[PDB]
């Protein structure tokens, strides 16, 4: 009965001072990815919005961020492009912290753009990776 | 707001040109090319100055036999790095 | 046009890469602390808007800063390098941390991390209960707040 909203609110409102038992129900949550169509897209947008948030410490957000990035190519490309763009825009405020993440995301997005015979978009996406002006 | 906050941060950073050298000003070819002279008729390398301008070694050799100044900044040329 | 609150009193020394002997010779992968990321982003934007065609390489081993303790008995303010500040910031989760947590948070190299740990032990900021601080898997460091400072500056520089 819409308990997902209550769980999400409790999780972000949680202090999480322990952090030692988070692994169990984060691995449980990891396999809970397939939510059919638009529900999956909304859930992934909410997840990345909650993990982009400033209050989350930069010790576990990066690891699950790369794990979600590697889980992303399993999705169909049509929605994969949209979620890649959305997470690129959401990580845009904090790029210097997430450099591996943006690099991998842009590489995957450029690949899927190239497989669509769209060279301009793929080249522009690959350009956005900071290779000299990067930390 | 936190338990152990940060007040001040004295940062130190180094700035550098995004593209230092990409073409010899004399031959107009790329600095990794054959200086246009070795290209038409043949080791080609870079020769920097005290201004760090990085022309082709052969191109700056040909330029120096007529003019004593750097092509770009028009100052007295002194060799540095090779 | 939009209000910018860095949360940090920011002062920087931007130096020529070619002129200065300093360089990013070490392969340190030091992860930036999250509190002062806004400062570096704002200054990178300012430098891009001001000087075109340049890039910035922050020397994370030469920048220092002040961390203030005010609710732990008001023990004045400490001044430490960013390497010595990332570990203190990671100590915010709890009084005792492991080497794995520091490795995952600061993302520093083994040599730099061990140097920071040794310098902290010289300060006696953190300590080990036993003599197991050697190369192992536990590395159970802990706080030593009972050994409060005597001066206020506590300006370590060597
Ligand atoms: Zn030339
Ligand atoms: Zn030549
Ligand atoms: Zn010159």
* Positive or negative torsion for Cα A44, A49, A50, A54: positive
Q: Which residues of A89-119 are buried (b: 16+ CB within 10 A; e: fewer)?
A: ebbeebbbbbbebbbbbbebbbebbeeeeee
CA B51 – CA A79 distance, rounded (Å): 53
CATH (residue range B1-82):
3.30.40.10
Rg of chain B over Cα atoms, rounded to whole angstroms, equals 20
Which of C37, C101, C104 has its CB closest to that of A97?
A: C37
Residues 6+ apart with CB under 8 A from A90: A48, A49, A52
CA B80 – CA B47 distance, rounded (Å): 7
B30 known ligand binder = no
C76 near A CB under 8 A: no
Nearest to B80 by CA among B58, B44, B47, B55: B47
B11 burial type by CB count under 10 A (0-12 exposed, 13-18 middle, 19+ buried): buried
Q: How many CA atoms lie within 13 A of C67 on its CB side?
A: 23
The answer to whether A60 and A19 are in contact (CB under 8 A) is yes
CA A45 – CA B64 distance, rounded (Å): 63
Nearest to C31 by CA among C99, C89, C86: C86
CA torsion angle for B30, B36, B40, B42 (degrees, to 10)? Answer: -80
Cα of C114 to ligand 2 centre, how many Å?
50
For chain A, where are the alpha helices, taking DSSP H only?
A: 3-13, 22-30, 38-52, 61-71, 77-91, 100-114, 119-127
CA torsion angle for C52, B46, B71, B50 (degrees, to 10)? Answer: 80
CA B57 – CA C135 distance, rounded (Å): 52
CA C26 – CA B41 distance, rounded (Å): 43
The answer to whether C34 and B32 are in contact (CB under 8 A) is no
CA A92 – CA C81 distance, rounded (Å): 28
B51 known ligand binder = yes
Approach to solving: cryo-EM
Q: Which residues of C32-64 are buried (b: 16+ CB within 10 A; e: fewer)?
A: bbbbbbbbbbebbeebeeeeeeebbbbbbbbbb
Nearest to B54 by CA among B28, B20, B15: B20
The domain spans of chain B are 1-82
Rg of chain A over Cα atoms, rounded to whole angstroms, equals 16
**Residue C83 has which token pair?**
């390497």
CA C80 – CA C101 distance, rounded (Å): 20
The pairing of strands C141-143 and C96-97 is antiparallel
**Residue B11 has which token pair?**
């940062």
Q: Do A96 and C32 touch (CB under 8 A)?
A: yes
Which of C34, C55, C56 has its CB closest to that of A97?
A: C34
Query: Which three-class secondary structure state does DSSP give residue C155?
Result: strand
Q: How many CB atoms lie within 10 A of CB A72?
A: 20
Which of B4, B6, B15 has its CB closest to that of C8?
A: B6
C8 near A CB under 8 A: no
The answer to whether C54 and C44 are in contact (CB under 8 A) is no
Nearest residue on chain B to C38, alpha-carbon basis: B9
CA C133 – CA A46 distance, rounded (Å): 42
Residues 6+ apart with CB under 8 A from C151: C76
Side-by-side strand order, sheet with C126-127: C96-97, C141-143, C126-127
Beta partners for residue B8, in sequence order: C9, C66
Beta partners for residue C57, in sequence order: B14
Stated resolution in angstroms:
3.0
B35 known ligand binder = yes
What number of H helices and E strands is found in chain B? 2, 4
Cα of B34 to ligand 1 centre, how many Å?
8
CA A30 – CA A64 distance, rounded (Å): 9
Rg of chain C over Cα atoms, rounded to whole angstroms, equals 17
Least Cα separation, residue A111 to chain C (angstroms): 27
Helix axes A38-52, A3-13, angle to 10 degrees: 10
Cα of C158 to ligand 1 centre, how many Å?
48
Residues 6+ apart with CB under 8 A from C9: B7, B8, B9
């Amino acid at each position: 009965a819409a308990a997902v909203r209550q769980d999400l609110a409790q999780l972000m409102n949680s202090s999480g001072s322990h952090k030692d038992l988070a692994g169990k129900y984060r691995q449980i949550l990891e396999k809970a990815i397939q939510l059919s169509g638009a529900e999956q897209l909304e859930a992934l947008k909410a997840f990345v919005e909650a993990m982009v948030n400033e209050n989350v410490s930069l010790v576990i957000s990066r690891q699950l961020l790369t794990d979600f990035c590697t889980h992303l190519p399993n999705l169909p490309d049509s929605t994969a492009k949209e979620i890649y763009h959305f997470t690129l825009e959401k990580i845009q405020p904090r790029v210097i912290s997430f450099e591996e993440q943006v690099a991998s995301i842009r590489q995957h997005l450029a690949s899927i753009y190239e497989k669509e015979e769209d060279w301009r978009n793929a080249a522009q996406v690959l350009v956005g990776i900071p290779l000299e002006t990067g930390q | 707001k936190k338990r152990f906050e940060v007040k001040k941060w004295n940062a130190v950073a180094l700035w550098a040109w995004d593209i230092v050298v990409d073409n010899c000003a004399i031959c107009r070819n790329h600095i990794m090319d054959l200086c246009i002279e070795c290209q038409a008729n043949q080791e080609c390398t870079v020769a920097w100055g005290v201004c760090n301008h990085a022309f082709h070694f052969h191109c700056i050799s040909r330029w120096l036999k007529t003019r004593q100044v750097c092509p770009l900044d028009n100052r007295e040329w002194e060799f540095q790095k090779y | 046009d939009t209000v910018i609150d860095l949360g940090i009193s920011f002062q920087i020394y931007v130096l020529q890469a070619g002129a200065w002997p300093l360089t990013q010779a070490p392969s340190s992968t030091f992860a930036i602390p999250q509190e002062l990321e806004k400062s570096v982003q704002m200054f990178e934007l300012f430098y891009s808007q001001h000087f075109s065609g340049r890039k910035l390489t922050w020397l994370h081993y030469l920048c220092t800063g002040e961390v203030k303790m005010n609710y732990l008995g008001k023990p004045y303010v400490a001044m430490v390098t960013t390497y010595q500040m990332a570990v203190l910031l990671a100590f915010n989760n709890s009084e005792t941390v492991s080497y794995k947590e520091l490795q995952d948070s600061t993302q520093m190299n083994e040599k730099e991390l061990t140097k920071t740990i040794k310098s902290l032990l010289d300060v006696k900021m953190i300590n080990h209960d036993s003599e197991k601080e050697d190369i192992d898997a536990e590395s159970s460091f802990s706080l030593n707040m009972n050994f409060s400072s005597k001066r206020t500056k506590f300006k370590i520089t060597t």
